[PDB]
C-alpha cells in the first residue's frame, strides 16, 4: 500500500482520487486516515460518470451520463512521507451517444474492450445502442459503428471464455420484459445477428406467469462432453429484478434449466459478481467464470435497500458483506483481482472488503453518492 482508488462521485459528476492504507476508516477516529483525497474532471450532475475502464496506469476511458465517451490521460506529480498524485486530461471524446426516446432515462451499461494489440471498445446503452469506438493511429477516439438492439437493456456482456484468435464476437443482453439474447457481431463491427433468445419458465404453481427482467449476466465455459450439432454450446447465469438466479445451457435449449428464487417476496436485485470463496481469481478480464461447472459458481449481488448478498449456484445465501456497516443501497460492487470487493453506493463511503475473510479493509467518506470505483496499482512512497 497504499492503495490508489478512483471513485465516481455522482453528485458533482466528478472522479476523486483516494490514497490510503489498509485499516483506514474515516468514521473511526482512532483508525488510519487517507493520505489524500482530491477531485478531478467535475462535470456536474448532468454529466456524471456511468462507467470507467482502465487501459493502463497512464490512460482510462470514461462513459458519462451526458452521452459522452472520453479518453483520459493520467499523469503523476509529486504531492507538495512523499508520494505521487494523479492529474487527468481528456484527450478526445465522442458525443451524442444516447437515445432517451427508446425509452427512466438512458445510461451506459457496458464499457469494455472488444477483446483482451487491440484498441477497440464497446459502449452500450439502456436505449439499445451498441457503439464501437476505437483509439485510432492518430491517438483520437473514432466511432466505428452504432448498432441497434432491442430496448430496454439492463446489461450487455461480452463472451471471452474460449480464445482470442477466432474472428467470432458473441455477447448477451436483455432487460425489462426483454428476454436474454445472444448476438454475433461481425468483426467489421458493421452488422450483427441474433443467434439465440431465451424462453420464459412455465407459469408458477398458482398458474401465474413468472415475470421476466434479467439485470446482469455472467458466462461459464461450455457444457462438457459430447455436443449435438445444430445447438450452440454456451452456459451462463443471470440475476433478475424479481429475485431470480437463472441458469442456462444452450445445449439444453432456450428455457433455463433452473430458475431459483433467491429471496422472499420478489425482492429486487441488481448486479452479479463472480467470486471464489478463497479469494482466488477465477474470472476472465470481463468477469466471466472460468469454469464449466455451475456447482462451483458463487456470486455477489445487491438489493435496493442496503444489502450485499453472496449466493452459491444453487441459490443458498452464503452471507452478507458489510451487514452492519453499509446503510444505503449498494449501487456499485465489483470483485477485483479475485481477492477484493470494491463497494460504494448511496451512503457515500467507498469501501474495500477482503473476499476470503469478509473483513472491511477500507472505509473512506467521499461526500457523494458513488456509482463506480476502480483500483489502480499501489502507490510508491518514500
From Swiss-Prot:
Subcellular location: Nucleus, Nucleolus
Keywords for the protein's UniProt record, in alphabetical order: Nucleus, Ribosome biogenesis, rRNA processing
InterPro entries: WD40_repeat_dom_sf, WDR74/Nsa1
Chain ranges passing through the membrane: none
Assigned GO CC terms: nucleolus; nucleus; preribosome, large subunit precursor
Record carries keyword Nucleus: yes
SUPFAM superfamilies xref list: WD40 repeat-like
Main location: nucleus
GO aspect biological process, one term: ribosomal large subunit biogenesis
Note: Present with 2740 molecules/cell in log phase SD medium.
Assembly notes: Component of the pre-66S ribosomal particle. Interacts with NOP7, RRP1 and RRP5.
Family: Belongs to the NSA1 family.
Protein's job: Involved in the biogenesis of the 60S ribosomal subunit.
The name this protein goes by in its record: Ribosome biogenesis protein NSA1
Native species: Saccharomyces cerevisiae (strain ATCC 204508 / S288c) (Baker's yeast)
